[PDB]
Prior knowledge:
- The record marks 5-6 as: Reactive bond.
- This is Trypsin inhibitor 1.
- The chain is 0% helix and 0% strand.
- It is largely without helices or strands.
Amino acid sequence: GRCTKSIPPICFPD
């Protein structure tokens, strides 16, 4: 579910 604070944001499978 998590997501990085970048763009495009890299979201984790969780």
